[PDB]
Amino acid sequence: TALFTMGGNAEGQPCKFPFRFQGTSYDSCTTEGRTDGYRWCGTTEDYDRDKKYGFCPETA
């Protein structure tokens, strides 16, 4: 699927790859920090700085 926020908080922006989080670069959906089942993506170059994200497809 393509990436949309759809639950996400990043002002309607689609996922940004590669996004930096925990000083580590991610080019795919992560589950770090979510114990609710959902997988998220950063929506900027650096998530650590910005703190705006989107949702990603679970079971991927």
From Swiss-Prot:
Fibronectin type-II domain ranges (all copies): 10-58
Post-translational modifications: Phosphorylation on multiple sites modulates enzymatic activity. Phosphorylated by PKC in vitro. The propeptide is processed by MMP14 (MT-MMP1) and MMP16 (MT-MMP3). Autocatalytic cleavage in the C-terminal produces the anti-angiogenic peptide, PEX. This processing appears to be facilitated by binding integrinv/beta3.
Tissues/organs with expression: Produced by normal skin fibroblasts. PEX is expressed in a number of tumors including gliomas, breast and prostate.
Induction statement: Aspirin appears to inhibit expression.
Source organism superkingdom: Eukaryota
Disulfide-linked positions: C15-C41, C29-C56
Parts of the chain that traverse the membrane: none
Function: Ubiquitinous metalloproteinase that is involved in diverse functions such as remodeling of the vasculature, angiogenesis, tissue repair, tumor invasion, inflammation, and atherosclerotic plaque rupture. As well as degrading extracellular matrix proteins, can also act on several nonmatrix proteins such as big endothelial 1 and beta-type CGRP promoting vasoconstriction. Also cleaves KISS at a Gly-|-Leu bond. Appears to have a role in myocardial cell death pathways. Contributes to myocardial oxidative stress by regulating the activity of GSK3beta. Cleaves GSK3beta in vitro. PEX, the C-terminal non-catalytic fragment of MMP2, possesses anti-angiogenic and anti-tumor properties and inhibits cell migration and cell adhesion to FGF2 and vitronectin. Ligand for integrinv/beta3 on the surface of blood vessels.
Clinical note on disease: Multicentric osteolysis, nodulosis, and arthropathy: An autosomal recessive syndrome characterized by severe multicentric osteolysis with predominant involvement of the hands and feet. Additional features include coarse face, corneal opacities, patches of thickened, hyperpigmented skin, hypertrichosis and gum hypertrophy.
Domains as described in the record: The conserved cysteine present in the cysteine-switch motif binds the catalytic zinc ion, thus inhibiting the enzyme. The dissociation of the cysteine from the zinc ion upon the activation-peptide release activates the enzyme.
Entry protein name: 72 kDa type IV collagenase
